[PDB]
Every structure is written in structure tokens, then in C-alpha cells.
């Protein structure tokens, strides 16, 4: 086509989706990770995660307002990945890298799994 | 704005 | 903070939101523009438009499944702007620029209004 | 990935 493109548009959209998440606006699901609860938008979760994409395209699960994750999932690892989904920024640290990588593998977030593998390999 |  | 950032994350999220829109997945509103109907995600519309942001933060309108736009709004202009919201690409042409600019002013999409003004000024 |  002969379209023009606004470079900062995708980043501006994601910034506003994060602002709606912070103010709890039009969030339509609560993700339960052991004792912890995280409110989010189903569309953003599907757009970022192979696991959520599979869950919310399922004819019965698409209508659930609560999703319970596997008890082995660490709430902090999930929180870090949820923040990444809404911001593009990953808070990866020596003390959380193992939990973040295991959570990213479970959530099917291949780019996160890739950088965790590289950061671990460098420390070996 | 750019030409993509 | 000490976060790392994935450069293509925002663009990848927007690409997936557009794929969900094309397959009509988790769309929660229909925008009526005279005889034409457009299905979309309320969160994406709010993230892109000052008008939709105001409508869907309103305690009564947030629950509507149908929104009717002003009869002066051109369906093609709306279609072009909806495509822009989901892709960052604006199909701006001599034959549609006046309708696109008027629709962007109504929808409160200031960056689109800005480029339409500049393209018009250059042709004068 | 980059340092933002
Ligand atoms: O590593 C990842 C990140 C990811 C996201 C999604 N999301 C979507 N993919 C295709 N079309 C659609 Cl419509 C969506 Cl929402 C699926 C798989 C994976 N894997
Ligand atoms: O030109 C534009 C594009 C636009 C988008 C929005 N959106 C939001 N702004 C602030 N926080 C939130 Cl939560 C959202 Cl969704 C509001 C005004 C405007 N004006
Ligand atoms: Cl990822
Ligand atoms: Cl804009």
C-alpha cells in the first residue's frame, strides 16, 4: 500500500493499556497464583502469551472471570511477566531469574525464555 | 510519521 | 530501575490485537457509522481515541455493546482510522484526507489531525 | 533486548 506509519503508536497504545490496568478499567479476568490475585485484560494476556492465547480461544474458558495457575508458579515471577506484558520492560535479577524463566516457559513467552537462557549461560 |  | 527492554514487544502486541479483531475474538462493542457496523475492542478504542476514552470511562456507557456515531461521520474515514488504531499505518489519500481529518478531530486523535493538517498545507 |  501507500500508507504512512506513526512510529510511537504501538508504544502509546501499550502505555494506555497499562494505565487502564493500573486504574482497574475494563479488566475482565483475575489470574490466581496461589494466594495472590492479578487483574488483567484477556486480550493483552492472549497477545503476549501462548498459554493465555490457547485458554481464551477455548469456547468454555473464554467466559471464565477467574483462571487458576499451576501451584508450582511463583507469584513474583508472574507479577514480573505481567508487568513485562504491559510495558515491554523485564525486571530480570539474579534472585528472580529462575522463577521468571520457569513462569515464561509455562506461559509460553518465547522471547523472555530466550533472554533468560542467555543470561543464565553467561553466569555459568 | 514515516514511510514504512 | 535495572529493567531490560524488548524493542519489538509493543508492535507484536498490536499485531496480535489486530489478528484477534480480524477473527472477531473477544470484541465487545459494535461502532455504528450510519449504515455501517465495525466490531472492536473497547480497550484499544480508548487507548487510541480521546472520544472513546471519555465514552467507556462513563459509568453507564462503559456497559453498552453498541455505540452510534454522529451522522456527519463518514464510514470510510472511520474504517481508515480504525485500521490505523490496530496497525500504526494510516491510508491517507487526496480523495479521503478531508473525511479522515474530520473523523480524527471528532475521535480526538491528535497525531492524525496533525499529519492531515501538514499534508493539506503542503497542497495549498 | 536493550538497556532502555
Ligand atoms: O511467545 C509467544 C507469544 C504468543 C502470543 C500468542 N498470541 C497470538 N498469536 C497469534 N494470533 C493471535 Cl490472535 C494471538 Cl493473540 C500466541 C503464541 C505466542 N507465543
Ligand atoms: O489523541 C489522543 C489519543 C488519546 C487516547 C486517550 N487514552 C488514554 N489516555 C490516558 N489514560 C488512558 Cl487509561 C487512556 Cl486509555 C486519551 C486521550 C487521547 N487523545
Ligand atoms: Cl515474550
Ligand atoms: Cl493519533
CA angle C86, C35, C63 (to 5 degrees): 60
Q: Are residues C96 and A12 in contact, defined by beta-carbon separation less than 8 angstroms? A: no
Q: How many structural domains is chain C composed of? A: 1
One-character DSSP codes across chain A: ---EE-TTHHHHHHHHHHHHHHTT-S--EEEEETTEEEEE-HHHHHHH-HHHHHHHTSTTGGG-SEEEPPTTS-HHHHHHHHHHHHHSEE---TTTHHHHHHHHHHHT-HHHHHHHHHHHHHH-
Nearest residue to D1 (alpha-carbon basis) of A89, A4, A14: A89
Pocket of ligand 2 contains residue C81 by CB under 6 Å: no
Q: Give whole-number Cα distances, C11 to A115, A116, C14, in Å.
A: 19, 21, 5
Nearest residue to A55 (alpha-carbon basis) of A35, A75, A31, A72: A31
Q: Please give the Cα distance from C106 to C98 (Å, whole number).
A: 12
Could you tell me if residue C31 is left (phi over 0), alpha (psi between -120 and 50 degrees) or otherwise beta?
beta
Residue A121 belongs to what domain range? 1-124
Cell of A77: 515471577
Q: Are residues A25 and A61 in contact, defined by beta-carbon separation less than 8 angstroms? A: no
State the smallest CA–CA distance between residue D1 and chain A in angstroms.
Answer: 8
CA A50 vs. chain centroid, Å, equals 10
Q: Are residues C116 and C104 in contact, defined by beta-carbon separation less than 8 angstroms? A: yes
Pocket of ligand 2 contains residue A14 by CB under 6 Å: no
CA angle A111, C11, C27 (to 5 degrees): 105
Pocket test for ligand 2, best of A11, A16, A17, A25 (most atoms within 8 A of CB): A16
CA angle A9, C27, A36 (to 5 degrees): 85
Environment class of C17 (CB within 10 Å of its CB; exposed 0-12, middle 13-18, buried 19+): buried
Q: Give whole-number Cα distances, A5 to A1, A97, A116, B4, C97, in Å.
A: 11, 36, 32, 6, 15
Residue C115 CB contacts under 8 Å (≥ 6 apart), including other chains:
A4, A6, B1, C90, C92
- Nearest-atom number in ligand 1 for the CA of A113 is 1
Nearest residue to A111 (alpha-carbon basis) of C12, C2, C86: C12
Pairing of strands A66-68, A29-33: parallel
Pairing of strands C4-5, C89-90: unpaired
Q: Please give the Cα distance from A2 to A52 (Å, whole number).
A: 35
DSSP structural state of residue B2: B
Cell of A22: 493500573
User: What is the CATH classification number for the domain harbouring A102?
Assistant: 3.30.710.10
* CA nearest ligand 2 atom 7, residue: C47
Experimental resolution (Å): 1.9
For the CA atoms of chain B, what is the radius of gyration?
4
Bridge partner list, B2: A5
CA atoms within 13 A on the CB side of C96: 17
Cell of A35: 494466594
Cell of C15: 499485531
One-character DSSP codes across chain C: ---EE-TTHHHHHHHHHHHHHHTT-S--EEEEETTEEEEE-HHHHHHH-HHHHHHHTSTTGGG-SEEEPPTTS-HHHHHHHHHHHHHSEE---TTTHHHHHHHHHHHT-HHHHHHHHHHHHHH-
Interface A:B, ≥3 CB–CB pairs < 8 Å: yes
Contact B4 C115 (CB under 8 A): no
Q: Which residue of B has its CA nearest to A2?
A: B3
Amino acid at each position: 500500500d501507500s500508507c504512512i506509519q506513526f512510529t510511537r503508536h504501538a508504544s502509546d497504545v501499550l502505555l494506555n493499556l497499562n494505565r487502564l490496568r493500573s486504574r482497574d478499567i475494563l479488566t475482565d479476568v483475575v489470574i490466581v497464583v496461589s494466594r495472590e490475585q492479578f487483574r488483567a485484560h484477556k486480550t493483552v494476556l492472549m497477545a503476549c502469551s501462548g498459554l493465555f492465547y490457547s485458554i481464551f480461544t477455548d469456547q468454555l474458558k473464554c467466559n471464565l472471570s477467574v483462571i487458576n495457575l499451576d501451584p508450582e508458579i511463583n507469584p513474583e515471577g508472574f507479577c514480573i511477566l505481567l508487568d513485562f506484558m504491559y510495558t515491554s520492560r523485564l525486571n530480570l535479577r539474579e534472585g528472580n531469574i529462575m522463577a521468571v524463566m520457569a513462569t515464561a516457559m509455562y506461559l509460553q513467552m518465547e522471547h523472555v525464555v530466550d533472554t533468560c537462557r542467555k543470561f543464565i549461560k553467561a553466569s555459568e | 510519521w514515516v514511510i514504512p
